[PDB]
Design a protein around this ligand. Structure first.
Ligand SMILES: CCCCCCCCCCCCC/C=C/[C@H](O)[C@H](N)CO
Lengths: 232, 245, 56, 245, 245
């Protein structure tokens, strides 16, 4: 035995940064997208989702990297000075911005990153922030149980396999700069890298296209292709 | 193969899921009232049967004092011992795959996502049945809000063939007539609510179709017997009465 | 934050027997409630409170 | 006087019946599900009240998991801790005798002997009430088959004054507002059926009539809280469903 | 509970604020002239009383030689022992919260901010009184420049319920008739001017309304007695004569 399995380890399997979200933030004269709130999850994309759903439970420290790409929108010769983007983390319960100049942007206790355009992509790390002892990719249950004494069925009605409505909060991204006379549109791509990963209860990989945050399937349910029984 | 005695119930290969025996972590532990084999309602395996599925501990919600402890206390944990019995003659042929899936989330029948109701998602001891194809619900006025498992997709968007990654046992009528799986408590928490969360899912699929001699129609019984093991509850309060309709 | 998955429970109060008072005594009284955390208490993931707001 | 904590229930002289603390003798023993204080329905002590009586363990037949264990198992044994609460002002006067009678057999209301029905002999948490005189049942067509306890005869043909030979506690409003009796398991057998046999009888008699200032009508509540202690059951089978009508 | 003797004054639970006893740091220290109990003017607690507030050392500015030393010297420091007395019968019901707030800044009555005058901000031994609502001053020509404390806001924009974070004592008439708080010297400096800066604020709030039998109007006295402790002064010069109007 001289061939090794260093690259098949769980840490190596997730050691790549996967894009999990693309957020559009526009700066223009203040129906608008001057600030964008994105709920944190890996299920907006399939690749990392499929890799993680190889297992039932996980525990990993995350690393987020933000790549910002700005462009003009129908500019004739209108130009702009280098922009600064504010990415504020809003955990469940904290107030959420209602405008791009709201008081919530003060970031007194909410962590925030101020990224200057043209610099290196903004990278930070997060520890395991799970309420339980491990993350639950699959939850075979509800959060509310409808009881006999409930006045109406909606009291106990809950989404299947949904644990909490506000899983880990949102990221609110704005352009701190005031509006230039010409519109500037930017895309922030968030790349998520698990680290120190531990996994439990392996599961078969998804074989059909994802349909929503659950195991629901709707279309393209015939994956295997035609092949002769005795054809090599 | 050998005697299997738990509490006051005895059953005349057995696989331990993930190589872990059920174990304990002031939790209330009924050493006898709950540690015993409860027999679920028998199902009938025919030539046109697609499969069956049950959810644990939901299947034992009305089984003796185990259900009473489950409903009275707030959060409880329990391992299980599942024993599937299917006796056939030497001239019968077939094979059953018995899979114990942790967090056996199933797919719905409507375009709305995660819209399955608690009543339908918790069938109890009767369980449910897989289907050959995906039948989309069309009753917009009164959606059924029930699962639509697919046999070859395992009801979760994965291929049936890879389901053997889960703890499994094959009842092949030519060699064995019973299967036994010992499941420990598997969850992201040391203890969790049982009324709202199901820890395990038992799926029985007819891998090879049943056949007998040259008979057109043949059906044989399958009986599931589940023994809670090392079950402990905590958070005693008034009794929970779920709305099953 | 209000979440049915991390629901904590309920607190209720009832009359075990009654309030009994003699003559020349107020038949209606008032009780006060106080709440505190124990030594095992802990918090996590600092954030911004929703109680205080500033007009912008 | 001091904190009295059992399981998850705490109550802010206490007499141990016969100087014996409840003790254990594979019996099923819920250390938490059953070892806790259950509060019976409050009764109202007035100036024209003759007394009240309850039967144990019958009074706890529908109290949480204790009743479920009592009905599911064949034979069980349990000690008790009875706590009677009756709060009154300094200007109230009265006295309650709380007696824990072993094998508190009561007299009927008809000329037919030992004709009392199970439903009437097992009132539950509501209990019964003594009477000043002996009212003979006259409904020959439909006899009521109910007890006819007499206050001064204690409902058993004996004098009330000698009832103090039994374990007893006097709640005298001028000095104390509560009584506490700790009853061990008393029976001719180490363990016996609970559905058909009642081990104890709690009788509360107004030894001195209630009075308050110069008020014509005064009534105060009496609340009984019973904690099973060292309760163990054996002989698990299907649930018993007595006909209470 | 026990004798409380300071200098030549004796008073027949006591809480030490922040667990710190008053202590000394050539300061002039009158061990007897200042270390004694001075009794403030009695106030009358009624059914329509919102509360009272005093400022220390301002309340003792005209109390014997303590006031003379306070005005003659430049900067002085002093701990205090506050004793609130309110005697009521067994048939009275009520509760007083006595809070010793460090730097008890209060809110004004005008739209202009921090416009309260020195004369109004330093009432002396008479103190002030809280109000149910916030009455905005409307005398633009001659603003009153006085505080407008609000009972439930504690006069500082905070909730009354959290005021217990401060050193506090509850006089509940059913159990106790007096409260005693021992305040050390609390300031950002080891010693500071007393004429311009008040180190403590004593706020007495009727947490539970006063009531007696079925009487429509009932009022009982509240007397505050304050003993300076370990008081030392420095910077002797001509006497200060504040303009109180
Ligand atoms: C500006 C600073 C940014 C701070 C970002 C903190 C966000 C915290 C989110 C951490 C975990 C998110 C992703 C991991 C959880 C998985 O979705 C689990 N499987 C949950 O089901």
């Amino acid at each position: 035995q001289r061939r090794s399995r260093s690259e098949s380890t769980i840490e190596s399997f997730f050691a790549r940064g996967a894009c999990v979200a693309i957020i559009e933030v526009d700066n223009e004269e203040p129906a608008q997208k001057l600030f964008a709130m994105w709920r944190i999850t890996y299920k907006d994309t399939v690749q990392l989702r499929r890799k993680l759903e190889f297992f039932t439970y996980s525990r990993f420290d995350m690393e987020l990297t933000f790549v910002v790409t700005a462009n003009f929108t129908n500019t004739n010769n209108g130009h702009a000075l280098n922009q600064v983007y504010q990415i504020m983390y809003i955990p469940p319960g904290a107030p959420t911005p209602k405008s791009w100049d709201d008081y919530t942007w003060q970031t007194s206790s909410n962590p925030s990153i101020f990224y200057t355009y043209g610099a290196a992509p903004a990278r930070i790390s997060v520890p395991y922030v799970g309420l339980a002892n491990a993350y639950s990719h699959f939850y075979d249950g509800f959060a509310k149980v409808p009881l006999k004494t409930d006045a109406n069925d909606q009291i106990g009605d809950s989404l299947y396999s949904a644990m909490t409505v506000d899983d880990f909060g949102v990221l609110a991204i704005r352009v701190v700069n005031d509006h230039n006379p010409t519109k500037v549109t930017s895309k922030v791509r968030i790349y998520m890298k698990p680290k120190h990963v531990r996994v439990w209860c392996p599961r078969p990989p998804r074989a059909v296209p994802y349909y929503g945050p659950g195991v629901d399937y709707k279309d393209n349910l015939n994956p295997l292709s035609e092949k002769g029984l005795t054809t090599y | 193969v050998l005697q299997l005695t738990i509490g006051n119930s005895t059953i005349t290969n057995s696989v331990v899921a993930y190589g872990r025996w059920p174990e304990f972590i002031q939790p209330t532990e009924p050493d006898v009232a709950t540690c015993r084999f409860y027999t679920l309602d028998t199902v009938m395996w025919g030539k046109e049967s697609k499969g069956w599925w049950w959810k644990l501990p939901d299947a034992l919600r009305d089984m003796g004092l185990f259900g009473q402890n489950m409903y009275y206390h707030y959060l409880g944990r329990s391992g299980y011992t599942v024993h599937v019995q299917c006796n056939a003659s030497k001239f019968h042929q077939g094979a059953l795959g018995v899979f114990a899936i942790p967090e056996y989330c199933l797919a719905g029948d409507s375009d709305k996502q995660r819209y399955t109701s608690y009543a339908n998602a918790n069938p109890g001891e009767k369980g449910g049945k897989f289907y050959s194809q995906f039948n989309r619900d069309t009753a917009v006025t009164s959606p059924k809000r029930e699962f639509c498992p697919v046999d070859y997709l395992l009801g979760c968007g994965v291929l049936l063939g890879n389901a053997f990654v889960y703890p499994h046992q094959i009842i092949n009528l030519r060699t064995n007539n019973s299967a036994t799986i010992v499941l420990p408590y598997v969850n992201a928490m040391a203890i969790d609510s049982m009324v709202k969360h199901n820890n395990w899912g038992i799926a029985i699929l007819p891998l090879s179709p049943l056949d007998f001699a040259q008979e057109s129609s043949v059906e044989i019984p399958i009986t599931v017997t589940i023994a809670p093991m090392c079950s402990e509850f905590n958070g005693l309060r008034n009794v929970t009465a779920p709305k099953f309709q | 934050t209000q979440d049915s998955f991390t629901e904590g429970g309920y607190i209720s109060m009832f009359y075990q027997t009654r309030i009994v008072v003699p003559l020349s005594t107020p038949k209606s009284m008032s009780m006060l409630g106080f709440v505190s955390a124990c030594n095992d208490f802990s918090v996590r993931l600092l954030r911004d409170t929703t109680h205080i707001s500033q007009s912008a």
